[PDB]
UniProtKB/Swiss-Prot annotation, chain A:
Responsible for RNA synthesis (replicase and transcriptase), cap addition, and cap methylation. Also performs the polyadenylation of subgenomic mRNAs by a stuttering mechanism at a slipery stop site present at the end of viral genes. The template is composed of the viral RNA tightly encapsidated by the nucleoprotein (N). The viral polymerase binds to the genomic RNA at two different sites in the 3' leader promoter thereby initiating either genome replication or mRNA transcription. This is RNA-directed RNA polymerase L. It is found in: Virion; Host cytoplasm. The keyword S-adenosyl-L-methionine applies. The chain holds residues 8 to 1380 of 2005 of the full protein.
Swiss-Prot record, chain B:
Belongs to the pneumoviridae phosphoprotein P family. This is Phosphoprotein. Residues 1-24 are annotated as: Oligomerization and binding to RNA-directed RNA polymerase L. It is found in: Virion; Host cytoplasm. It comes from the Viruses. Disulfide bonds: none annotated.
Swiss-Prot record, chain E:
The modification Phosphoserine is found at residue 3. Belongs to the pneumoviridae phosphoprotein P family. Plays critical roles in regulating RNA replication and transcription through its interactions with multiple proteins. Tethers the RNA-directed RNA polymerase L to the nucleoprotein-RNA complex. Recruits the M2-1 protein, a processivity factor that is required for efficient transcription of viral RNA. Acts as a chaperone for neo-synthesized nucleoprotein by forming an N-P complex that preserves N in a monomeric and RNA-free state and prevents the association of nascent N with host cell RNAs. Recruits the host phosphatase PP1 to inclusion bodies to regulate viral transcription. Constitutively phosphorylated by host. This is Phosphoprotein. Residues 1-25 are annotated as: Oligomerization and binding to RNA-directed RNA polymerase L. The gene is P. It is found in: Virion; Host cytoplasm.
């Protein structure tokens, strides 16, 4: 009834080109930035939006009397204009942030036992607010004004579905509209037409500018008065402001190519790091390699521009002549070198400049035409290396099977092998790499495997259901382009075509495609792939949207129809499940490989780029290994589809505006090859076969390693391939190391380049380069073992309303907390993190919550109502500090502070609730402004509950650590569950309607299954949840909830509905005032579990709170004694009463910038001591292996319990099709009686890293043996609640926050438990019979998400 | 070397057996699959077998359904 | 020690039969005539109907 | 006396010859036929002859693409890639006056 | 003296055929039309015995 077209507040997208060309062409009545068909069409049949903009700008000042400069050229006007000074408001926010951070630091120092000399500059007066250097204000006033303008636009566009907002700003009068915008400069007499993208990107630019200059100003202001408190970086704010202005001027002068020329900045910075950390033999090589390419781009620029500008309104303008652009490059690399004063932490922090300047105006069909010439080439191959690749692939597979399975992968014919490979067949082992030279690979390539694996029969809906744009079919394509941009013939033929095809094949959204289907049959893919009905798919098309990323002028994202994209996703899934392992390099990358393990034998490295790599591949190159994978997987053609179907079809580049230069023919295969189309794409698309191309890029390193006799390893952080080479020279005593490493590096480089040239890639000089150590493992600059951070990359865009689907203060604040905490996890200066957090949380709460686009003053009236509630509760006299007390409070208690006190010392934890409780406890203990008997009444208020409600257990199953009785803050997933079930119910997909009507019945029946159990182990309930099919359905629901338009899936509106608007408003309204809700009653009749140490035991309050919101159901396992309150600290030297001790290895005042002898501290839970099955694990899909693990975990968590065996039998019967006594041997047999500690499972962390990096962690050695006399004398030898991995990680964070605050690090410090806070967990005895029947119906109606039924394997 | 003179015959012909399998795989691609000879040039891969088996035995079970 | 003398030779014959079977397919699509390229497709379509 | 053993050493060189063919054997990959119609099937050929055929069948910029990518290559010896004379201005300007 | 001087004869008579057909770098479509079916039904035998045992 009421739709909304709410624009976004940050970029969240891409800057287009054709939209800007059309917005120019319409108003100019002359081609703008091009003369392509876009111009002609726009000028001829202009669309409603640009016609309303034409009318508005015609009523406003004339176009014809101004010099219409492109939008890029006005950056030096926009970033140099001035609007009425908002520095009073900067100072106000900074003072409030300083006060809040003083509170937080007092909270820290209290339990850390710190103190000072009663000095007013205790820590937080080095930042003299009155002395702001004014280089941040020049960006902050610009940004406040621009954001106010954009917020006015949003507010008026939520009301009117289309509006033209004309706003003055200094000498720059803007005009905004959802689809177009214009800028006129009364000072310079020049107009620029552009769109929202390129309007709010100068806003993200100025925001990142401000929070990057401010975060270094605070750092140097704290480093001039205490070395170590600030980030380890010395950047000159004036110098970097000069850098910004200079490159903004060069970007103004070069129209749209200073971005492709700023891409060199990263190379320059890497070359400077190499000059610092190596000798000339490599730094001068990388420098001379990149400088030549930079100079070549610079010369070519002029010609590029004059080609682009022909027949346009800028041929009567002129392009900067060489020497001035060279002087500007000189000034800006002078700046990038003076900022980097030989320092590998300055150079590390400098990386933000890539994204700072702004994203380029990516042209839609020019990247595509550029890569045409690269895609259409014939490439000569060498059959010898081509088969050596196959041999290496086979060898990796064989090593994988030998390691995992202990048997040889089944082979069709055992006669294609020599006697060597036959006896190795009977040996089951794999020749060490000194052997297997060429001929061995050549004869290994002759093998044909049998079907060892198997394709899943049913379509995994959890996989196929993921929100991505889907290209329309071939015949029904023109609907992506407006109805005014097409001829009448094509229009009629489209209007009549659209009635032959079903409603499924009109959508450009996967969820709509699979909901609005009438005839969906989960078994279809097993027929489709086998019968090969895609090899000539005539309703097949490939749309290249040109969605891309920072600082480059092309990355073309594909869009394919649904039939095809099920095949792409299937191949990728099957690879990731079966063929990706057997290959350590590529799955191990993110989380194990680089961090902990990689860290005369001539040693060296290569950093070769593989970003523009997908365009060099052919079928004759890729099918060699794709067919091996396909033989293992068991079908004719499944992995080579990208090269089989693509060359027939046509690339469109189907952006909303840009049409093709049609002549009046409807079949795209007929159209003559345009600039925006080309049929024969002989190559490979980006991201469609990435795993297989990384597999052949790794498998060639083995070929090279056997041709040579070195030891090569590879690491692939994302887009690149980084190789490490190690070769004993056995030639020494002359040139000792550097010429040896250099000649080894050059030889290896030549060999790798020849290996790639024999396959078809023309590796460039400026992409690949050389170094001795690999300095680029995951884009973190490690040198000599110390990991120099890149702290400010994430804190650039931490302004208000970040990462939100709808404007929700809770999620915005949580995102700010999560980004900014990287200046504590990756970065130092926790003080900087507290300041740049509180500044923006203040701007979100007390200055931006008033003008909320959806609810208006509702939010602020609510916040001032819980502010008056808390004031009247805690008896505060001044309102200036009640916002401080409300903002130093966790989110789960309705106060805005999304950094819990545990997040600042150990990243992960059980019992968030109790950690928050201890946080607020220490806050109220240190806050010597309130009166006592209220800091103790707050807890009675927390405990005074209205518990007599439903004891629903699905809440615990979905979040084992939850409170209930309306205390838990409702999230989008729960609040939208009943709306998305309601909408799913009316869906022509019989399967989904049938599962969704049953959703609420299964959800109310699951609880029953373990209602009458004592004690309720919520992690056991989580296991019972994962074992059932319901989990996947709940995950699908959670995925389709967070879409920003929930109740318009079955309707082409692309708009938000008033129902969802009101729902989100009610959520953020009834979530903030939770503090008033829990402070409205106060019961006095609770003896509080107080201590006789001066503090409260938080575990005896959290347990009672949970049991009382739970009906006293005796939840056993979920709570952990917080390290913050019990384990107190005292600094000392090797003398104490047997507390857990932490000692430093050095004698330097500070403990930074070093790696010590140790191997780092990461805390492994030591979970699941596994007597793993030794039967085949191959033929079972990941889904089935997970299910088996869950059933075994049930068999272990519940033992001797009634009905458990019948429960498992029914579960098996429904999920897998088999019984439980015929799958018993396949399960994992655990042997332990401490499943509480052991059974690390989802929603239970299995690692306990500290809040410091590895290099800071490599300088502390710990002993915990002295605590076992206390533990074993008070408590029995049975296990203890406390988690010493977390304790020791918090002690190392203590040593870090202490070295940072005071520059004298303790030589040793000991942490002592107080055992009144810590309890014990004896392994319980479950007393209660399950309800089992209900599982039968639950699997009768959630069977579509169940795994495939095993007919006969065991 | 009466028996060591033909082990290098077997190995040196297995090498060309492998180079020939590779050349077949490279010469069976978009161009054979445009017309329908890629499947014969590669061979049957134990799933089309199961498809024809199931369809043939469904048509053979459907004889008893009259 | 009867693997070095006759087993190597019957294995060579088997390997050679497989070599010839490959070499007989290597020259159909691109070495052979485009008119006879389409010959085997009707066998690949009839095999769906040729098996009980 | 003569045709009981020499046949082995003859077929040895016969199939080594076969390898002499195969090893250097080259495969041009599939492409248009340069009329913008039809995917030209792969070429099983010796490098030189296939380079000549392809060079004579290709048109426009593509010919320069193939001539630079295949006939040319990255001639590198003993590293230390010479800074081009035009970039020497950017390098003296950058590493001076700082 | 029963097979060692019999197998080599067939071997040497096949080698020349092999290099004769390799020097080309009508009757073969039939050869592969039988070559595929030769294993298609030998493997259907085992794919069905997996249904049977």
């Amino acid at each position: 009834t009421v739709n909304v077209y709410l624009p976004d507040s940050y970029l969240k997208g891409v800057i287009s080109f054709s939209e800007t060309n059309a917005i120019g062409s319409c108003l100019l009545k002359r081609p703008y930035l091009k003369n392509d068909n876009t111009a002609k069409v726009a000028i001829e049949n202009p669309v409603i939006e640009h016609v309303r903009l034409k009318n508005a700008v015609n009523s406003k000042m004339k176009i014809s009397d101004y010099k219409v400069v492109e939008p890029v050229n006005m950056q030096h006007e926009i970033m140099k204009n001035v609007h009425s000074c908002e520095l009073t408001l900067l100072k106000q926010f900074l003072t409030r942030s300083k006060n809040i951070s003083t509170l937080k630091l007092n909270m820290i120092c209290d339990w850390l036992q710190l103190k000072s000399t009663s000095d007013d500059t205790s820590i937080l007066s080095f930042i003299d607010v009155e002395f702001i250097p004014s280089w941040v204000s020049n960006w902050f006033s610009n940004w406040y004004n621009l954001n106010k303008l954009i917020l006015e636009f949003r507010r008026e566009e939520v009301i009117r579905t289309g509006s033209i907002l004309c706003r003055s700003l200094g000498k720059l009068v803007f005009i905004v509209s959802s689809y177009g915008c214009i800028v006129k400069s009364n000072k310079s007499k020049r107009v620029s037409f552009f769109t929202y993208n390129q309007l709010l990107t100068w806003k993200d630019v100025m925001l990142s500018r401000f929070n990057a200059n401010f975060c270094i100003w605070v750092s140097n202001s704290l480093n001039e008065n205490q070395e170590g408190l600030g980030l380890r970086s010395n950047l000159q704010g004036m110098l970097t402001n000069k850098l910004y202005e200079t490159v903004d001027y060069m970007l103004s002068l070069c129209c749209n190519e200073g971005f492709s020329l700023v891409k060199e900045f990263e190379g320059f910075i890497m070359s400077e790091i190499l000059r610092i950390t190596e000798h000339a033999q490599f730094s001068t090589r990388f420098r001379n390699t990149l400088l030549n390419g930079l100079t070549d781009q610079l010369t070519k620029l002029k010609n590029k521009n004059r080609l682009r500008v022909h027949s346009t309104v800028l041929e009567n303008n002129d392009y900067p002549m060489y020497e001035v652009v060279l002087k500007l490059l000189g000034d800006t690399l002078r700046c990038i070198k003076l900022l980097i004063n030989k320092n590998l932490e300055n150079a590390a922090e400098l990386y933000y400049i890539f994204r700072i300047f702004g994203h380029p105006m990516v042209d839609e069909r020019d990247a595509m035409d550029a890569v045409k010439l690269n895609n259409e080439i014939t490439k000569i191959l060498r059959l010898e290396s081509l088969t050596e690749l196959r041999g290496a692939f086979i060898l990796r597979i064989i090593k994988g099977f030998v390691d995992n399975n202990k048997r040889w992968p089944k082979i069709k014919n055992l006669k294609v092998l020599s006697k060597r490979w036959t006896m190795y067949f009977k040996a089951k082992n794999y020749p060490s790499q000194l052997e297997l030279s060429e001929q061995d690979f050549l004869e290994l390539a002759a093998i044909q495997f049998e079907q060892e694996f198997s394709v899943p029969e049913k379509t995994n809906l959890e996989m196929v259901l993921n929100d991505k744009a889907i290209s329309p079919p071939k015949r029904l394509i023109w609907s992506v382009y407006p109805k005014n941009y097409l001829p009448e013939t094509i229009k009629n033929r489209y209007l009549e075509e659209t009635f032959n095809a079903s409603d499924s094949l009109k959508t450009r959204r996967v969820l709509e495609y699979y909901l609005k289907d009438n005839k969906f049959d989960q078994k279809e893919l097993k027929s489709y792939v086998v019968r090969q009905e895609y090899l000539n798919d005539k309703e097949h098309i490939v749309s290249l949207t040109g969605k891309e990323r920072e600082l480059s002028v092309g990355r073309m994202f594909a869009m394919q129809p649904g039939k095809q994209r099920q095949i792409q996703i299937l191949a990728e899934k099957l690879l990731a499940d079966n063929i990706v392992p057997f290959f350590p390099e590529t799955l191990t990358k993110y989380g194990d490989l680089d961090l902990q393990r990689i860290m005369y034998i001539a040693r060296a490295s290569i950093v070769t780029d593989l970003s523009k790599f997908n365009q060099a591949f052919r079928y004759e190159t890729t099918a060699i290994c794709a067919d091996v994978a396909d033989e293992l997987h068991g079908t004719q053609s499944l992995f080579c589809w990208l090269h089989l179907i693509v060359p027939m079809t046509t690339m469109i580049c189907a952006y909303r505006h840009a049409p093709p230069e049609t002549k009046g023919e409807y079949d795209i295969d007929k159209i003559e090859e345009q600039s925006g189309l080309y049929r024969y794409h002989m190559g490979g698309i980006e991201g469609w076969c990435q795993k297989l191309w990384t597999m052949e890029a790794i498998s060639l390193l083995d070929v090279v390693s056997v041709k040579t006799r070195c030891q090569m390893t590879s690491l692939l952080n994302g887009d690149n391939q980084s190789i490490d080479v190690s070769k004993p020279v056995k030639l020494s005593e002359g040139l000792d190391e550097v010429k040896a490493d250099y000649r080894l590096a050059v030889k290896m480089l030549k060999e790798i380049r020849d290996a790639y040239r024999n396959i078809g890639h023309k590796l460039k000089e400026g992409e690949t380069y050389i170094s001795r150590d690999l300095q680029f493992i995951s884009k973190v600059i490690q040198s000599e073992g110390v990991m120099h951070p890149t702290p400010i990359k994430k804190v650039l865009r931490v302004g208000p309303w970040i990462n939100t689907i709808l404007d929700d203060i809770k999620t915005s604040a949580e995102s700010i907390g999560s980004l900014c905490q990287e200046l504590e996890f990756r970065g130092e200066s926790i003080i900087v993190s507290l300041i740049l957090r509180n500044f923006w949380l203040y701007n979100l709460y007390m200055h931006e919550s008033k003008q909320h686009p959806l609810a208006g003053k509702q939010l602020f009236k609510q916040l001032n109502k819980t502010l008056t509630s808390v004031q009247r509760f805690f008896e505060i006299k001044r309102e200036n500090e009640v916002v401080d007390l409300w903002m130093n409070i966790p989110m789960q208690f309705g106060g805005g502070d999304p950094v819990v006190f545990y997040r600042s010392f150990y990243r992960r934890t059980p019992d968030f609730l109790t950690e928050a409780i201890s946080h607020v406890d220490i806050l109220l203990k240190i806050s010597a402004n309130i009166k006592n008997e209220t800091k103790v009444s707050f807890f009675k208020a927390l405990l005074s509950i209205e518990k007599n409600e439903r004891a629903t257990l699905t809440t615990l199953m979905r979040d084992p650590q939850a409170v209930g009785s309306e205390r838990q803050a409702k999230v989008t997933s729960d609040i939208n569950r009943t709306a998305v079930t309601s909408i799913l119910s009316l869906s022509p997909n019989q399967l989904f309607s049938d599962s969704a009507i049953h959703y609420s019945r299964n959800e109310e029946e699951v609880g029953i299954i373990a209602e009458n159990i004592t004690p309720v182990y919520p992690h056991g309930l989580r296991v019972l949840y994962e074992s059932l099919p319901f989990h996947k359905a709940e995950k699908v629901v959670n995925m389709i909830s967070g879409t920003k338009s929930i109740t318009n899936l079955l309707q082409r509106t692309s708009a938000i509905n008033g129902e969802d608007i009101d729902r989100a408003v009610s959520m953020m309204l009834e979530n903030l005032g939770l503090l008033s809700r829990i402070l409205s009653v106060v019961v006095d009749s609770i003896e509080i579990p107080i201590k006789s140490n001066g503090r409260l035991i938080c575990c005896q309050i959290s347990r009672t709170l949970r049991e009382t919101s739970w009906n006293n159901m005796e939840i056993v396992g979920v709570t952990s004694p917080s390290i913050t309150t019990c384990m107190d600290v005292i600094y000392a030297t090797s003398s104490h009463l047997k507390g857990i001790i932490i000692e430093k290895f050095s004698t330097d005042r500070t403990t930074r910038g070093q790696r010590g002898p140790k191997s780092p501290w990461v805390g492994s839970s030591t979970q699941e001591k596994k007597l793993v099955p030794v039967y085949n694990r191959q033929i079972l899909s990941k889904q089935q292996r997970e299910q088996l693990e869950a059933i075994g975990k049930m068999r272990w968590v519940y033992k001797g319990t009634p009905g458990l065996r019948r429960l498992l039998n029914k579960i098996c019967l429904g999920s897998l099709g088999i019984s439980y006594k015929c799958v018993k041997p396949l399960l994992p047999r655990f042997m332990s009686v401490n499943f509480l500690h052991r059974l690390s499972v989802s929603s239970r962390p299995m690692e306990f890293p500290a809040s410091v990096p590895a290099y800071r962690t490599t300088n502390y050695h710990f002993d915990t043996s002295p605590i076992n006399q206390a533990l074993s004398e008070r408590f029995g030898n049975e296990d203890i609640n406390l988690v010493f991995q977390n304790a020791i990680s918090c002690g190392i964070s203590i040593m870090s926050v202490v070295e940072q605050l005071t520059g004298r690090s303790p030589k040793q410090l000991v942490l002592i438990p107080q055992l009144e806070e810590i309890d014990i967990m004896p392994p319980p005895v479950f007393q209660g019979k399950f309800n089992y029947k209900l599982v039968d119906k639950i699997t009768s109606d959630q069977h579509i998400f169940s795994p495939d039924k095993i007919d006969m394997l065991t | 070397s009466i028996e060591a003179r033909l082990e290098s015959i077997e190995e040196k012909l297995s090498m060309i057996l492998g180079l020939l399998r590779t050349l077949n795989i490279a010469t069976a691609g978009p161009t054979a699959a445009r017309d329908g000879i890629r499947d014969a040039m590669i061979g049957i891969r134990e799933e089309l077998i199961a498809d024809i088996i199931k369809e043939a035995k469904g048509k053979a079970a459907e004889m008893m359904e009259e």
